[PDB]
Design a protein around this ligand. Structure first.
Ligand SMILES: Nc1ncnc2c1ncn2[C@@H]1O[C@H](COP(=O)(O)OP(=O)(O)O)[C@@H](O)[C@H]1O
Ligand SMILES: Nc1ncnc2c1ncn2[C@@H]1O[C@H](COP(=O)(O)OP(=O)(O)O)[C@@H](O)[C@H]1O
Lengths: 114, 62, 375, 160, 375
């Protein structure tokens, strides 16, 4: 098989993944917007007096504390996977290094020149 | 850490105009923090994908 | 010649020293472990001449020189001669020297420890090397060969080490060291060629018979059948050209020399041969090791260039080995050079950069440091 | 055809300008603009490759499909990427990891033949019975029947 | 990662560890309860190599490792080793982090406190499991076996439990902890195979004998006539292939080993054996209980997979038992895996959702809580 068929299909294959990845990002933006509407609903502050506005303020204090408690735990979970990835990646590098490390190089040229 | 990170509003001694503005300040903070949670959750899932791929790569080269 | 402080690598035996720089997959040049001296009285003047000759100089002017080898069975007995050989190796021909480069040496696991102590002292005090490491020849053969496991028969010039390695670890209880090597095979050959009417006694003659062995000899997969024909027919004979235009015609001696590897009794040694020796290095290891060592018989060093050695060894081990089990042999073109090559690989590995003795640790501890820092 | 177009697309401006300037050594001047094949060894070295005489001859043996005795400029770029892999950037592991995940619809850690076919047919390019398998067997260096994450990264290095 | 926050279940014996998630019908993976460590000095560099290997890694790399068992006849004495086995189990084979799931572990109640206390502590403090539950092996075996009443004979690697249960209730005064197990059967076989000319004294050798036992041995309902013939004829010997290709044949020794369970004097133990111990557990229960236990002897754990064992046990008990009555053995295919299967069943029962220790109650009380919340 000609190089041009093989290269164009792996090229087209990567290009479709790029379109799908751009969609993943748009889908995440769409879902984040909807998640925000329901997770952090708007304040009905207009038309309220002192006691009513204080209740909104107290509710927000509880809500900001809760959003950081959950954010912190999620942040820790993201961090845990990053640490495991760095460790798994190094194990892979050493297993693979054993296959090519000791034998691959650009050598024995001066051997003929001399 | 959370006590240091959470924002706190003045409440009991504020009048209506002050309370509307203070309620607004945490609302936007919460909104932005919920946005971070969403993105962190998506990052977590993408990183979990990489984790299982890597666990298999170790066994595949061993 | 070089634009980086790469480690230098030297494989110093009783035959030749292979040398070059780390990162290459071959030595840059070969330096015979020879110091030559005139055995005649000079008559003419204005003739140049040396007090002593080394390496290739020693061989090129050998017609009137006696040629001596400073190394015996892997041990330097004359290190003043090795310093002259090394000075030439480094400063005249390879154009690199320990003075501006770290240096790796290759050695057997049971090489007398005092020998490493002296080589360590020389490279640090005579050649001013900034750092050193002395590596196991079997390790170097396994890196060059693409393996972490196997029995390495390092076939030196004066001794064969025979050490099993598994998963990168030594299995020292199963080392079967044998006092049989390429230089002893030469002795057998010259004695049998003497029987045919071609004695080899003096230096020029000693060098010729070594050269005959390297170019004409082989082991073959079956000695007795090879002899049934070689001892019966001239069709198995080969005429070798001697320096003066005369020739020597050699018959079954062509294989009887190499055969000493399988029959050490030929030179008076109390041994069953290299295949039995390899077998015991495998067989004395635990049974969950044995399968990996049977699958990895690694030939290295010299004499492995003899035709039929891969087949002779695999078949003899298979015969000694349990049935069902698969016996495999590694005998790459990186033969005779694989110890040097492994030295290049090891010296340059990133995993080895902290394994070097620096010329700080050396002076604080002295030469005996090699016994604690290398192996 | 498309291999020749792709080699042009993959070479950057600071590189293709050197390739044509050095490659023009193939014509002596006041001739016919032939651009001969015997000059390939010289240009490999002019551009920064460091081949042995055997390698210089191999570059020559791999060109001249029509027996014309010449090398064109786009043909040269194709022959150079197969000798000296001067692609454009060539991306990264992080970029291909995120893209790998898109073909791996079932999150299995590899791209099997069905995913490979769906992703390609989805581009509008017609996929025939022998296609897809031809790529799987290219990426699948270990002959395990699929292209995994590691194999994917090797397979698509230099792909845009 | 799962479709429910299902408990994870891990059955950690002195032999092997079976693990998977609650609600399945099998463990996802089985590991040896082994942590292996190299007993050799490394020679090559850049070889990777762990300080310790666990489970199947420990067995696959065993050629140069000493293999230790963290569990001693049902008791974890080395909890650092069990934490590593568990991390491997949970993250590499089950692919589920315990932080999001309750975990159920098992032990005999006869176990002298430390096992349930440390099992609870490891999962709460090193894995941050949201909840814990240490289960009874007899309970788990009866659920897996389809019984509420009967005697659980779990004759596995560590200790034989032999605990009777009636209508879901323990009858603890009748439970006889018995120091006769699969691990002792292996040691006996290593010694009698030594007499035959095949010595087994090292770790690799111990693992081989265990493999021989598991594949070649049987108990026989009639061992006396079986040995009269097996000890007289090669026609009853079975060949086993050793890892290095050598072959061992085993004759009356094949059953002689399992026979120890009925003849404990073979290993120096002062015991009546498992059939009489089971009988005595029945006898020690009230007279209106005895009949239900005689009719419901239930096999679990290991060694219960030997040919002739269900018949050997039923006949020995019948011989000790009174007339008129029918003595019966239940021997489900969920043998050896029955404690794990029971864990899946128990963890998932609605009537067992209040039995879990939460990771709140745990910290307020500490690990001694296991004595108030589990049993
Ligand atoms: N065709 C051959 N026949 C016999 N011996 C050979 C042949 N080729 C190489 N050798 C031997 O190789 C030896 C030199 O290389 P080597 O022994 O590997 O270096 P070192 O002795 O330092 O380990 C010499 O003894 C030489 O005779
Ligand atoms: N075919 C067999 N022959 C002899 N013994 C067996 C066989 N199958 C299982 N056993 C024994 O089972 C023991 C494992 O005990 P096990 O019941 O699985 O502990 P746990 O209940 O905690 O999982 C091992 O010693 C093994 O030899």
């Amino acid at each position: 098989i000609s190089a041009s068929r093989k290269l164009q299909l792996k090229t087209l294959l990567l290009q479709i993944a790029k379109q799908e990845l751009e969609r993943e990002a748009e889908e995440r933006r769409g879902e984040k917007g909807r998640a925000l509407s329901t997770r952090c609903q708007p304040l009905e502050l207009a038309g309220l007096g002192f006691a009513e506005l204080q209740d909104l303020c107290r509710q927000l204090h509880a809500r900001v504390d809760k959003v950081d408690e959950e954010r912190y735990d999620i942040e820790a979970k993201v961090t845990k996977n990053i640490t495991e990835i760095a460790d798994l990646t190094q194990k892979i590098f050493d297993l693979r290094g054993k296959f090519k490390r000791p034998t691959l190089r650009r050598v024995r040229i001066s051997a003929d020149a001399m | 850490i959370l006590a240091e990170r959470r924002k706190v509003l003045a409440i009991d001694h504020l009048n209506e105009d002050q309370l509307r503005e203070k309620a607004k300040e945490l609302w936007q903070s919460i909104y932005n923090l919920e946005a971070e949670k969403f993105d962190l959750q998506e990052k977590f899932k993408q990183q979990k994908y990489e984790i299982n791929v890597l666990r298999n790569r170790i066994n595949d080269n061993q | 010649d070089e634009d980086e402080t790469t480690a230098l690598v030297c494989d110093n035996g009783s035959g030749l020293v292979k040398a070059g720089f780390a990162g290459d997959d071959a030595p840059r040049a070969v330096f015979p472990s020879i110091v030559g001296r005139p055995r005649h009285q000079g008559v003419m003047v204005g003739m140049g001449q040396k007090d002593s000759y080394v390496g290739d100089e020693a061989q090129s002017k050998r017609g009137i020189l006696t040629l001596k080898y400073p190394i015996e069975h892997g041990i330097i007995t004359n290190w003043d001669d090795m310093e002259k050989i090394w000075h030439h190796t480094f400063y005249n021909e390879l154009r690199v020297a320990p003075e501006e480069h770290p240096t790796l040496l290759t050695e057997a696991p049971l090489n007398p420890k005092a020998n490493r102590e002296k080589m360590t002292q020389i490279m640090f005090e005579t050649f001013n090397v900034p750092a050193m490491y002395v590596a196991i020849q079997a390790v170097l053969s396994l890196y060059a060969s693409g393996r972490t496991t196997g029995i390495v028969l390092d076939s030196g010039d004066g001794v064969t080490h025979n050490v099993p390695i598994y998963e990168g670890y030594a299995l020292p209880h199963a080392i079967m060291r044998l006092d049989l090597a390429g230089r002893d095979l030469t002795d057998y050959l010259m004695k049998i060629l003497t029987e045919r009417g071609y004695s080899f006694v003096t230096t020029a003659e000693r060098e010729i018979v070594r050269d005959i062995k390297e170019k004409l000899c082989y082991v073959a997969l079956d000695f007795e059948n090879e002899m049934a024909t070689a001892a019966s027919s001239s069709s198995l004979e080969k005429s070798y050209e001697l320096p003066d235009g005369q020739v020597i015609t050699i018959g079954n001696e062509r294989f009887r020399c190499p055969e000493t590897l399988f029959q050490p009794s030929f030179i008076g040694m109390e041994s069953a041969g290299i295949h039995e020796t390899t077998y015991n290095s495998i067989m004395k290891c635990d049974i969950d090791i044995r399968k990996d060592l049977y699958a990895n018989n690694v030939m290295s060093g010299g004499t492995t260039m003899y035709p039929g050695i891969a087949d002779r060894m695999q078949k003899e081990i298979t015969a000694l080995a349990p049935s069902t089990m698969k016996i495999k042999i590694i005998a790459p073109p990186e033969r005779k050079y694989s110890v040097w090559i492994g030295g290049s690989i090891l010296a340059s590995l990133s995993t080895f950069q902290q394994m070097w003795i620096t010329k700080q640790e050396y002076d604080e501890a002295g030469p005996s440091i090699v016994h604690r820092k290398c192996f | 055809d498309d291999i020749y177009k792709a080699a042009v697309e993959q070479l950057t401006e600071e590189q293709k300008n050197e390739f044509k300037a050095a490659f023009d050594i193939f014509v002596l001047g006041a001739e016919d603009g032939c651009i001969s094949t015997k000059e390939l060894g010289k240009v490999m070295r002019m551009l920064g490759q460091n081949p042995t005489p055997e390698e210089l001859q191999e570059m020559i043996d791999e060109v001249d499909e029509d027996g014309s005795g010449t090398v064109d400029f786009d043909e040269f770029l194709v022959m150079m990427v197969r000798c000296m892999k001067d692609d454009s950037k060539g991306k990264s592991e992080e970029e291909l990891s995120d893209l790998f995940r898109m073909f791996d619809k079932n999150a299995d850690g590899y791209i099997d033949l069905d995913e490979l076919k769906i992703m390609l047919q989805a581009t509008g390019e017609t996929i025939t019975e022998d296609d897809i398998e031809e790529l799987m067997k290219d990426g699948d260096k270990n002959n395990d029947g699929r292209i995994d994450y590691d194999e994917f990264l090797e397979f698509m290095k230099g792909v845009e």
